Amino acid sequence: IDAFRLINANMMVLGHEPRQTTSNLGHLNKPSIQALIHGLNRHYYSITINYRKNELEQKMLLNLHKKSWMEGLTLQDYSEHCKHNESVVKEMLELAKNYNKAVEEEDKMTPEQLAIKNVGKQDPKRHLEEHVDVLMTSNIVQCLAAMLDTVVFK
């Protein structure tokens, strides 16, 4: 979204965009190439946009578009949760065997060059513990919500 304003031709011997004592002109956009090919900057000029943004409209649009009350202690119970506990471990086994491969390799093939010529978003740390995080977050939030429902409901 952008806003504009038509400039005169009477100031052809003077500075079009007659701007002055401020340093917030170089912000918000440099004049883009797809827009200065047209009447920028000799027919019209750009003008800055910020938003009259306030509380009681910010919070009612935050809290009402993304909210879940009774969902916060549901279970998604175990037939697909414990199934997903198989779904990650299996390739994590094979990716651990791939983690075995690079570490027992450990050759002086100029190892700062050996690490940089095989960046692949791959085994040793990238395709590692990322899975360990997902196994951790899924099982704790499952089991902690399970113990609370025993506590709360009788």
Partner 1 sequence: YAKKRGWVLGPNNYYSFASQQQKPEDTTIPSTELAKQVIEYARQLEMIV
Residue 135 tokens read as: 């196994």
CB of 148 to partner 1, least distance (A): 6
CB of 116 to partner 1, least distance (A): 27
Give CA–CA dist 78/71, Å, rounded.
Answer: 16
Residue 144 binds to partner 1 (criterion: CB under 8 A): yes
CB of 153 to partner 1, least distance (A): 11
For partner 1, the closer CB: 80 or 129? 129
Name every residue whose Cβ is closer than 8 Å to that of residue 19 and which is 6 or more positions away in sequence: 25
CB of 131 to partner 1, least distance (A): 14
Q: Where are the alpha helices (DSSP H) in the chain?
A: 33-36, 58-65, 81-105, 111-116, 130-152
Of 105, 100, 99, residue with least CA distance to 128: 99
Residue 140 binds to partner 1 (criterion: CB under 8 A): yes
Footprint of partner 1 on this chain (CB under 8 A)? Answer: 136, 140, 143-144, 147-148, 150-151
